[PDB]
Design a protein around this ligand. Sequence first.
Ligand code: PC
Length: 258
Amino acid sequence: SDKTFLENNQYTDEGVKVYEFIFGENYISSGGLEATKKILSDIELNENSKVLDIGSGLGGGCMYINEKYGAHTHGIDICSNIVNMANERVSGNNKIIFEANDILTKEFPENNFDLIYSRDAILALSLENKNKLFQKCYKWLKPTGTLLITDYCATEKENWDDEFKEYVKQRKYTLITVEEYADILTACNFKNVVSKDLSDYWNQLLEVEHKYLHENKEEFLKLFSEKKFISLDDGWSRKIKDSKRKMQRWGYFKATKN
Ligand SMILES: C[N+](C)(C)CCOP(=O)(O)O
């Protein structure tokens, strides 16, 4: 299954901790806390709001949203191990819930959420399933609700080089263009669809992370291994190179139900 693939490879316990080291405490999403602050900078919610976080990971996003706004946050992630980790980092807070489930089968009421939020998680879904997911999101949003997404995107497949092809294949990602992604949202009837190619900003975030990794190599080696360091270092190097030339892209999407 997809769950087994993710838990046994990219998102083993150790894989998750390695990612957390570079992204920052409670994050496996690009730019950790700082990108979260920026992405939510024009979003308004309050203590009565209901938020869904698709691919909630280590829970930092939900923690931040609940801290900033006092909103109810419900995170869903397919990896049981990551959800277990997230649940270890929050206590005594009845407005944060993390649930291990498949978002493609999970049931939520129509007109339920003020915000549906997702950070670098939908890349794992096939194109067919991306469309199915956004149809569900449309239903699940309140009439007054907002959809807010970042995700890994790419140039057209015809332009990919050997190394990028191998990365996408090994990861089992389905990476589409920012423009194709926006078109899915439009096709799902979302209004006010705003898409931004934030590859340059993503490149900046990657550079901050890369510098951090290099400056904290000794600590990393104590926690992990040189082999894992090299893999991480090389992985960020490629993302930096590929975002600079727009082969690997970072898409931002915001839309509304009405
Ligand atoms: C996709 N992610 C941002 C959740 C984790 C990192 O994946 P990757 O950049 O190593 O492919």
